[PDB]
Amino acid sequence: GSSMVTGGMASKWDQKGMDIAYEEAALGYKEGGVPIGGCLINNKDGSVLGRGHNMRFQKGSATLHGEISTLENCGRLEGKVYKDTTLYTTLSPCDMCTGAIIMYGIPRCVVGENVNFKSKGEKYLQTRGHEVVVVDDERCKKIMKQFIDERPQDWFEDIGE
Amino acid sequence: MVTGGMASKWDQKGMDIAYEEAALGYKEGGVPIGGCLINNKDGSVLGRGHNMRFQKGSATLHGEISTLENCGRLEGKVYKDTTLYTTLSPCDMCTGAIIMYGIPRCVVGENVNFKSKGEKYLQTRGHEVVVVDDERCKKIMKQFIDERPQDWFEDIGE
Ligand SMILES: [Ca+2]
Numbered sequence: 546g547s548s549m550v551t552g553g554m555a556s557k558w559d560q561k562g563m564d565i566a567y568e569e570a571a572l573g574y575k576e577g578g579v580p581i582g583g584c585l586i587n588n589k590d591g592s593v594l595g596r597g598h599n600m601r602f603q604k605g606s607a608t609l610h611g612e613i614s615t616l617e618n619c620g621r622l623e624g625k626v627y628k629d630t631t632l633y634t635t636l637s638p639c640d641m642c643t644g645a646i647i648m649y650g651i652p653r654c655v656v657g658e659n660v661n662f663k664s665k666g667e668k669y670l671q672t673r674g675h676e677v678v679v680v681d682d683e684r685c686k687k688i689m690k691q692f693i694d695e696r697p698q699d700w701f702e703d704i705g706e
Numbered sequence: 707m708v709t710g711g712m713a714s715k716w717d718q719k720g721m722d723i724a725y726e727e728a729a730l731g732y733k734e735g736g737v738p739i740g741g742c743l744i745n746n747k748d749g750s751v752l753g754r755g756h757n758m759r760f761q762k763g764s765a766t767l768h769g770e771i772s773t774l775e776n777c778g779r780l781e782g783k784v785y786k787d788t789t790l791y792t793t794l795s796p797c798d799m800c801t802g803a804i805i806m807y808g809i810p811r812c813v814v815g816e817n818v819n820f821k822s823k824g825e826k827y828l829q830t831r832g833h834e835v836v837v838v839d840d841e842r843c844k845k846i847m848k849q850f851i852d853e854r855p856q857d858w859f860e861d862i863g864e
């Protein structure tokens with residue numbers, strides 16, 4: 546990426562979005578799955594278009610990462626609806642989830658943390674014209690580290706290793 | 707597998723299956739984009755699929771994503787020696803799926819009706835991209851775009 550990128554500014558809906566994303570990650574964790582959750586919010590009025598969490602174990606899914614599940618839960622939408630929205634995710638996006646954000650033109654991504662995992666997508670989002678904010682949420686870091694430590698092979702599967 | 711530009715012995719089989727999936731999706735009333743994932747080691751078809759936007763009201767099941775979903779959960783190393791066949795050049799999301807899983811080769815039916823920055827990004831990231839320019843794929847895709855432009859735009863977030 547570029548030496549001139551900078552983290553985005555905070556939005557009035559960030560506490561709301563991160564809290565929903567974390568709640569989804571915790572729900573997934575209690576269900577026996579990967580603790581990664583998210584939600585898509587309209588930056589203009591704070592409305593929640595959808596929310597979701599990873600469904601790899603719940604549904605035997607190779608594509609339902611938390612971010613993809615969130616978008617699936619928003620349902621079919623005209624392209625214009627994704628404009629001026631923020632996708633909240635508890636963990637920095639992989640290359641696939643990053644690609645979903647780019648394809649739909651969701652302009653902003655707020656990331657719970659990038660300590661347990663980070664792909665080239667975090668910077669690629671900025672290269673492609675998207676704003677990224679990493680909030681370093683301790684709740685997210687704790688639950689994700691717990692999963693990685695207790696079920697390493699399951700985590701590796703989620704990121705294709 | 708290291709082709710050096712040569713087609714893989716399984717490439718025709720993969721593109722024919724991808725086209726069959728696209729044709730099936732078209733008959734089901736959906737977007738005519740299909741694909742399949744083949745194990746380069748033995749030619750086994752790990753899975754095949756097509757776009758399910760209309761069939762399932764899905765915002766994420768593009769042909770490539772549906773193909774991967776249909777393969778089921780797999781050990782990461784399996785993907786490292788596969789080829790993903792798609793009837794149409796991948797959008798940024800499908801490109802990202804290929805990159806995340808480390809699928810080394812992406813064989814594309816055509817990139818005339820659609821092409822994203824993903825086709826070149828795959829190359830930047832070290833993957834081999836093959837564009838066949840398959841007229842069967844091009845024809846069915848063009849028919850859908852001609853008949854249902856707004857539905858097509860919805861599939862690519864326009
Ligand atoms: Ca800005």
Ligand SMILES: [Zn+2]
Pocket residue numbers: 581610611636637638639642
């Ligand atoms: Zn992820």
Ligand SMILES: [Zn+2]
Pocket residue numbers: 610611612638639640641642643
């Ligand atoms: Zn992901």
Ligand SMILES: [Zn+2]
Pocket residue numbers: 739768769794795796797800
């Ligand atoms: Zn596509």
Ligand SMILES: [Zn+2]
Pocket residue numbers: 768769770796797798799800801
């Ligand atoms: Zn796609």
